[PDB]
Symmetry: D5
């Protein structure tokens, strides 16, 4: 599978994608209709973090009026990473980084307690975000991280 060596080409496309998305006043959910894939995956791809299968690449390119060059580049594996600074400054992204900063030691401790030595995978991995009401007024976001346990065993 084709892969990218640098972010520059996939970043240029992402700017074009965002330009068309705003110009047409489209939501990611609207862009994702007809892909057969999850919104979180296709939104990540459009923001340059995943390749798309051909059918998904052509349906988003149809809604955004993108040409064939964009369809080919959407199918290429990018050089991944949404936070080049390592630690974000944007408050929305920072809160998610802060969750890991606070509970990082706890998540390691409980993973080792309930699963054993090793990791929870970030590749054999799926992500979901859901809007639920708050019983005391307002809304909450439930973000589900679903990762395979990979054990570390002596060899």
């Amino acid at each position: 599978t084709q892969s990218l060596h640098h972010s520059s080409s996939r970043e240029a496309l992402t700017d074009i994608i965002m330009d068309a998305k705003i110009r047409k006043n489209l939501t990611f959910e609207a862009i994702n209709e007809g892909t057969g894939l999850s919104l979180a995956f296709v939104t990540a791809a459009l923001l340059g973090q995943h390749p798309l299968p051909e059918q998904a690449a052509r349906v988003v390119a149809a809604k955004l009026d993108l040409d064939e060059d964009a369809v080919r580049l959407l199918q290429t594996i990018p050089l991944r990473g949404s936070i080049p600074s390592g630690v974000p400054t944007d408050p929305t992204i920072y809160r998610f980084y802060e969750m890991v900063q606070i509970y990082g030691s706890t998540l390691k401790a409980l993973v080792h307690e309930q699963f054993g030595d090793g990791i929870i995978s970030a590749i054999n991995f799926k992500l979901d975000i859901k809007k639920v009401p708050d019983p005391d007024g307002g809304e909450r976001a439930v973000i589900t991280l679903d990762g395979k346990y990979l054990p570390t065993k002596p060899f």
Copy 2:
């Protein structure tokens, strides 16, 4: 409420906690028996990231054979942060960081799309981890991030 200016004295207590835990071969779940609180919160408190209410601090110090000085220190608010390096080197913790590194801009975009401008809070926030079977053989971790949406409104 009493607060700490540094992480060191709470780190010294954390070292005493982990030593007693290893010496007694105790799980965090067993230590959490009878607190009335979530295992994620209490484990984080033991690892120096949270204060404990008095009843929970006494019940943990009783299991770990800790003195009254530990009881008072467990009730003090710490200077928080489980990853002083900013980005972890430990693979288990790094995977959670990588989840944010990869999906950080996607989470921002989808939060703004489904909620609006603002953030998902990391303070009005609860964390949970559950072990589920993998349909293709193996174990999976389902980590749930549950935060309040705080809107950014023009003023």
Copy 3:
């Protein structure tokens, strides 16, 4: 709501805004005349840190002779962050960074003493700057940070 994956397209608009502002010899106060919003919020929005509602975006656009593409982009939520390096070199901004560096631990200590565990929010939050006379001669700036207390409670 429309969001921006990175700030350079908003940076380019910010460059155009500042260029029009200098050429027309305009103050932010004059630009803000018909927005119906606070000068602090709208100046930040012009500098790429906030979106504007449509009608407020149109009134700064009429002042600065910006086109409809600028009106659409001004309404988009940016990737926030006004200090790229994390630490400013500019003396004016640095003094505000220095206030946090000097009194940061005091602010935490007194928040915990007077409110309890948790944070003062930087999202449910309003900023104001006011010029007052100095009794000994000269002028002083009174900057008001007004943030909601969000408690950290055991769960």
Copy 4:
């Protein structure tokens, strides 16, 4: 006036002060009784960021049961800086850092618009934090930053 060349010897006193404070269940407000100085300044001094005049040093040393060496060290000017990393990990401190990250360019812009070229001082400067009720439920912190304007004039 006596001054210090490093953080360490003042850090050791700050550790002793915080240890005695927690062991005696004292608030910073109770420690500040009789000093004739503001809670924000004295709290900062106890946390290593300011010297205290002799009478203030003796009354906090009596309340905390500190010896004559502590009185002298409390009157010494420290090497200042409450955030050694430059960027805090603690959420309570981080929020104030975030306020500067977001509004830093705005603060500079309005300082130059409303005052002129130059800075708002961080030395000819006072800080206050006040707890007020939020009209819609809860509490808010009103943090006031009050600094002298120092002009930059051509020479």
Copy 5:
């Protein structure tokens, strides 16, 4: 399984281990006799990067005259990371870092071409080093990185 929250308790043991090794003039191969484990894994464990099963912990402890406290700690999962700076200064370690700096983009490209999107695991993974002669005089090291391919598939 017991885990550790930071380096120091294993760091202290690692120094004790190294001190005894140098005093007894032992090789890692000699220390590893009878464990049934690979020399690279056990050496890594002794250097504080892996836990050991009880049999291997008691075996290495017998060869180094370590007490039962060391046996228990050698069975605990450490906070992993052998290069705290992230980039080493030691030339011997730096050469392996240089290999990744030079061929990093190549390995990504060839992994995606030959395997597909995804990663080569560093957890489902074993390391080996072998000494072979150089056909033009001298010796060469053959280091084998053996990791499981984890695909990234659209979801």
Copy 6:
């Protein structure tokens, strides 16, 4: 031998090479046809990390429709380095960095035990990656680092 002072010019050529590669749907193995050189070396050269001999340079230029300016720049020694950030964010690349992070001290210890004082060369060095079917289902990557032992030695 001609060498480049920066990454800029060689980066522009890599963009053109990757664009031609994606457009023609070519593998690095297809581009490597009839060069007589290993796929890892030529791929690294195409990615701007090595110069190519004129014959190989003309071969891959023919298959990618590159002009004589590309033939000449492919023969120049670049300013090497594939990971500008020092630590990668891309998960595929990061896994290889993590192997050095975890096992770096072990590789140093075993190099010194099995060879002596000195280094395993990153210059007198060849890399190879092979796909090896994994026994438990799936595939494994066996990556071999083959470097010459260069002794460090009193003088």
Copy 7:
């Protein structure tokens, strides 16, 4: 007064200024002939670190054949900072950085001894450089830093 949010716009003007200065073989002293201001202040302005008053900006524009847009931009307050890297690589600039690196703690100690707690201002501040003969042959630079003392007084 008009202010700038980024370094680049004045950076472009500085490049224009330097290009015109080199083409005309002018010294900063010649350019400063009719400004009515100090050489050190005006040179810093031309290098993008200060605004010029209107009549002084028109003098330097006449010497350098700059247009009215340059005159306007020269009167805008910049985002200040001449060493974006924080520490310079240039040897001429580095020597001044090194004087502060070496004598920084001494300057603090003697400021506190001779003035009291507080700072020597960098805003109420003038700089001067003078060339004097060295008694042992050669030349010396005498750089004078002249800053107002701002006390830190308890409040």
Copy 8:
């Protein structure tokens, strides 16, 4: 001359020097009585940045009641540097760093204009600090940097 390889033994001595100086309530000017050397040089030596000739070392040790070990250590050349973080956080020291930050490019430009290519030395160099009254009220510090010009000539 005896030189020091790291800060620590000179660090500990500096701690002892400052401990005795505060306990005796001494000034650096009093400690410097009878050295025949400048206050800035001797203060920097006490702060770990310079060696002292034996007779100067013995008189500062006699004022502080230090032993013969301190006298020998004071004569050794330290590993120099008063700001280990590269950029200071202390406000008094930061102002001098900011001076170089703002005027660094101006100093280089006027050195090359008035002297030529090369540097103003930080080694063939003297520093002086002087307190003078401000005509408008208050006090000012006049810091003199006096360095030899060393040219860069083509060779």
Copy 9:
């Protein structure tokens, strides 16, 4: 003497210089013919690290067919520094950094022993590299660093 403010206009010339040297397949020694200056100085100047006297500037300009704007710019003093990252990643440059990293404290200790307190100058300094045969087959590089000794004397 004409000086520069930033790297880029001289960087643009260095790109043009390097582009012409590759297209003409010239060596630096060939470009240096008839300059009267050493290859090490003129190579550095062509790489943007030094100014050239006018004759040397016109000579290299005729060799690479550059205009009079390049001749004048080549006579300007640049903002020096060949490694913007501070630490190189290119292996060829890194080895020279490694030499200082490994032997830096030794050079300091031996400079102080054989010369005294102070420095070996990097400005009153000449560099030379020569190729010599290795008695065991192959070739060695003998790089000579020739710097004036500048003493640090008490003042």
Copy 10:
């Protein structure tokens, strides 16, 4: 050969070495009597950067009155690196770093011109420093770096 995992144990020995050296008023040259090794290698070993053969280790220990444990520690391979900050602040060391900063790209260029692709090794490497007179008065240091050329050949 025995090797060490961290710098601390050898750092403690280096501290003891320097203490005895200063206490005995010894030069590195006098400590190096009878080793049959060059001053630069043994000095670096004493500073924790190289191991010593048994005989050389015993002679420096007899000169410095170190015990048998120091003789064994002196024979172990350290974790190398004399500049933990990456870039030194000490002026004597910084000058040598500045030589590479300035001439780094020149050294690479001339190495590739005179030798070919590849490196000049820092392991098959010898360093020397000699004091020669300056024809204009004073002394100069001639530091010779003698490294084997290792080519990068296509494979």
